[PDB]
């Protein structure tokens, strides 16, 4: 996908061309900007017209290091249907160099990569998926759709 821009399941406009059920029943959700990072959602989107614009405008934002939802939207479904965040997020440039020595690290050296992974395990707020040393890419799943209250 050497696409300069980002593609969707199968695009903002392409999605609109969806049938009545298809629009409200989004099978596979795929959103990625290649360079920014590949993000895939296993959740659905039932709106029967995509009225996201009313809620915001961009409908979807992705920082080239961090993922951005609608706006800290804890899946607040006051009225209508909402999409869960039960998906995997992938971010590039995991290696944020070493500030201690300012050692520009851009290789699979993994000098302190192990330390970062250990911290993730302690964090019981997100589910660790799989970490690739060769690509240094970090993928994890944080589904907060379900609330205990």
Swiss-Prot record:
**Domain named Peptidase S59: residues:** 3-145
Looking at the record, which segments are called Nucleoporin RNA-binding motif (NRM)? Answer: 5-144
The segments labelled Interaction with NUP82 NPC subcomplex in the record are 3-149
Location in the cell reads: Nucleus, Nuclear pore complex; Nucleus membrane
Q: What is known of its domains?
A: Contains FG repeats. FG repeats are interaction sites for karyopherins (importins, exportins) and form probably an affinity gradient, guiding the transport proteins unidirectionally with their cargo through the NPC. FG repeat regions are highly flexible and lack ordered secondary structure. The overall conservation of FG repeats regarding exact sequence, spacing, and repeat unit length is limited.
Function recorded in the entry: Functions as a component of the nuclear pore complex (NPC). NPC components, collectively referred to as nucleoporins (NUPs), can play the role of both NPC structural components and of docking or interaction partners for transiently associated nuclear transport factors. Active directional transport is assured by both, a Phe-Gly (FG) repeat affinity gradient for these transport factors across the NPC and a transport cofactor concentration gradient across the nuclear envelope (GSP1 and GSP2 GTPases associated predominantly with GTP in the nucleus, with GDP in the cytoplasm).
Assembly behavior:
Component of the nuclear pore complex (NPC). NPC constitutes the exclusive means of nucleocytoplasmic transport. NPCs allow the passive diffusion of ions and small molecules and the active, nuclear transport receptor-mediated bidirectional transport of macromolecules such as proteins, RNAs, ribonucleoparticles (RNPs), and ribosomal subunits across the nuclear envelope. Due to its 8-fold rotational symmetry, all subunits are present with 8 copies or multiples thereof. NUP116 interacts with the NUP82 subcomplex and GLE2.
Describe the family membership recorded for this protein in Swiss-Prot or TrEMBL. Belongs to the nucleoporin GLFG family.
User: Could you identify this protein by its name?
Assistant: Nucleoporin NUP116/NSP116
The organism is Saccharomyces cerevisiae (strain ATCC 204508 / S288c) (Baker's yeast)
